[PDB]
Amino acid sequence: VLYVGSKTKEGVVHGVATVAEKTKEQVTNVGGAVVTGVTAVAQKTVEGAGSIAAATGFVKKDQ
Amino acid sequence: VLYVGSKTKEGVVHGVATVAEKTKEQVTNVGGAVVTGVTAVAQKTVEGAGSIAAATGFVKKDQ
Amino acid sequence: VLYVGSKTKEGVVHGVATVAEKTKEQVTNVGGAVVTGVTAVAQKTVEGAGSIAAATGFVKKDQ
Amino acid sequence: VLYVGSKTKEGVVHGVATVAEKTKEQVTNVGGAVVTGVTAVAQKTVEGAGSIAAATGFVKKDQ
Amino acid sequence: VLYVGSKTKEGVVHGVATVAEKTKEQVTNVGGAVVTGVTAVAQKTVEGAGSIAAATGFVKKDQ
Amino acid sequence: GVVAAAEKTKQGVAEAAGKTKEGVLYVGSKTKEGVVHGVATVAEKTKEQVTNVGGAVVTGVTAVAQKTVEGAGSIAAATGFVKKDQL
Amino acid sequence: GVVAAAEKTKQGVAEAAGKTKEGVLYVGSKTKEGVVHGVATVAEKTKEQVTNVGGAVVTGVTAVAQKTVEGAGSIAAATGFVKKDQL
Amino acid sequence: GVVAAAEKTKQGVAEAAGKTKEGVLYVGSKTKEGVVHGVATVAEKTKEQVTNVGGAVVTGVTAVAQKTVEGAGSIAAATGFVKKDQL
Amino acid sequence: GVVAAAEKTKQGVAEAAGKTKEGVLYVGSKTKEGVVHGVATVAEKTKEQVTNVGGAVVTGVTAVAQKTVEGAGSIAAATGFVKKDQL
Amino acid sequence: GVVAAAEKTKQGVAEAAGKTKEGVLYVGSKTKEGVVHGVATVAEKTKEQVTNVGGAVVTGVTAVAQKTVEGAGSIAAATGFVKKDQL
């Protein structure tokens, strides 16, 4: 009937950082999945069932 | 009837940081799933059943 | 009936940064999926079921 | 009936940065997928069921 | 009936940047995909089911 | 004088002088070298009498901003300076 | 004079002078070096009488901002300086 | 003078001079290097009489901000300095 | 003068001068080097008379801010200094 | 003068000058070296007046901030210093 929404956050990601210095890394992958970086996922769904927000670094071989 | 919502957050991720310095790393996987970068996921669903927010860094081989 | 929404955010990603200095990296993958960069995904759906927002770094060989 | 929406943001990404200095990198992949850059994806969907926002660093060989 | 929308954002990407200095890079790919650049995708769809916004950096060999 | 108003309507949105910095703003460097900034002086019931005989008299504020002053035996900034040197 | 108003409406929304810094704002360096900032002076019930005979008189404040001054035997900043040197 | 108002409304949202810093704000370095900041002086009931005979007089505040000064036998900052050296 | 108001409403949301920092704020370094900050002086009932005969007089505050001074036999900062060296 | 109010309301939310620091704030280093901060002086109904004969007089306070001073036989900071050395 009477709604006031001010500065409301729903499904929000903010303030994600990564700092590296003098860093060395080696990756040798064969048929797999390697994730080293940053993933920032924000999701807001209405009337949506079975919703996946993030799916990172999997190796799926279902039947 | 009479709702006021100010600065309300629902399903919010904030303030995620990683700091690395003089770090060496070596990854060698074969058919697997390696994750070294953390993920920030925020999810809000309305009338959504069976919702997954994060599915990071595994291996699924269901039959 | 009477709605005022001011500075409201739904499914928003903001403020994602990575800083690197004197960093070296080697990647050698064969048939795989290696992710090192930044992914920032924000999603809002209305009446959308089974919606994925991010699917980074996958290797999928389902049957 | 009476809606006022001021500076409301839905499915919005802003403020994504990457800073690198004195950084060397080597990638040698065959049949694979290597992602080292920045992907910033924002998606809003109305009455759309089963929508993917981002699919990065993928290797899919379904049958 | 009475809608006022002032400075509203839906499916908007802005403020994405990368800064590189004294950076050298080497890529040698055979039959694969390598992404090192910036992708900024903003999508807003109405009455569209099954919409993908970004499909960066993959290799798909479905049968 | 900035005024934004909305009276006697069913809906009103008023925005005064608002500033937004959305986007990418890049500055390589923003140095400032040898800068004098913001000098203010206030006096009340002002009355001045100056009598000078062979000298130098300056009334007011002094503000000197220099980046590089080269040379040996030089004077960069002087206020009320008397120099009587033999050689 | 910044004013934002919304009266006699069913729904009124008003923002005064508001600042947002959304996005990416990159600054490589923000150095300041040799800077004089914010010098204020207030004098109430003030009158001045100056009598000078062969000298130097300055009435007020002094602000000197330098970055680099090189050279042997050099004076960089001097207020009320008397120099009587043999050589 | 910053004002935001919403009167005689069913719903009113007033925002004054607000500041937001969402997003990425990167600064490589923010050095300060030889800086004089915020000097204030207030004087009430001040009458000035100056008599000078061959000297140097300065009446006020002194502020000197320098970064780099080289030189053998050099003076960087001097206030009320008298130099009488034989040679 | 910052005011945010909402009178005679059914729902009022007043927000005065508020600051938020909800992002990534990166600073590599924030050094300050040789800095004079915040000098204040208040004087009531001061009626100054100055008589100078061949000297140096300064009437006020002295603030010197330096980073680097090189040199053998050099003077970096001096207030009320008298130098009479034989050679 | 910061004011936020919501009166004659069935529902009121007033917010004064508030600060939020959510997110990631990163600082590599926050050094300060050779810094003078917060010097104050108040004088009420004091009694003084200056007469000088060939000397050096400074009236007030002194604040010197230096990071590094190098050199042999040098003087970094000197207040009321008298230097009469035969050579």
UniProtKB/Swiss-Prot annotation, chains A, B, C, D, E:
Lineage: Eukaryota, Metazoa, Chordata, Craniata, Vertebrata
Post-translational events: Phosphorylated, predominantly on serine residues. Phosphorylation by CK1 appears to occur on residues distinct from the residue phosphorylated by other kinases. Hallmark lesions of neurodegenerative synucleinopathies contain alpha-synuclein that is modified by nitration of tyrosine residues and possibly by dityrosine cross-linking to generated stable oligomers.
Phosphoserine, modified sites: S51
Part of the full-length chain shown: 37 to 99 of 140
4 X 11 AA tandem repeats of [EGS]-K-T-K-[EQ]-[GQ]-V-X(4) as annotated region, ranges: 1-31
Compartments, as annotated in UniProt: Cytoplasm; Membrane; Nucleus; Synapse
Sequence repeats: 6-20, 21-31
Protein name stated in the entry: Alpha-synuclein
Assembly, per entry: Soluble monomer. Homotetramer. A dynamic intracellular population of tetramers and monomers coexists normally and the tetramer plays an essential role in maintaining homeostasis. Interacts with UCHL1. Interacts with phospholipase D and histones. Interacts (via N-terminus) with synphilin-1/SNCAIP; this interaction promotes formation of SNCA inclusions in the cytoplasm. Interacts with CALM1. Interacts with STXBP1; this interaction controls SNCA self-replicating aggregation. Interacts with SNARE components VAMP2 and SNAP25; these interactions allows SNARE complex assembly and integrity.
Related illness: Genetic alterations of SNCA resulting in aberrant polymerization into fibrils, are associated with several neurodegenerative diseases (synucleinopathies). SNCA fibrillar aggregates represent the major non A-beta component of Alzheimer disease amyloid plaque, and a major component of Lewy body inclusions. They are also found within Lewy body (LB)-like intraneuronal inclusions, glial inclusions and axonal spheroids in neurodegeneration with brain iron accumulation type 1. Parkinson disease 1, autosomal dominant: A complex neurodegenerative disorder characterized by bradykinesia, resting tremor, muscular rigidity and postural instability. Additional features are characteristic postural abnormalities, dysautonomia, dystonic cramps, and dementia. The pathology of Parkinson disease involves the loss of dopaminergic neurons in the substantia nigra and the presence of Lewy bodies (intraneuronal accumulations of aggregated proteins), in surviving neurons in various areas of the brain.
Tissue occurrence: Highly expressed in presynaptic terminals in the central nervous system. Expressed principally in brain.
Family: Belongs to the synuclein family.
Organism: Homo sapiens
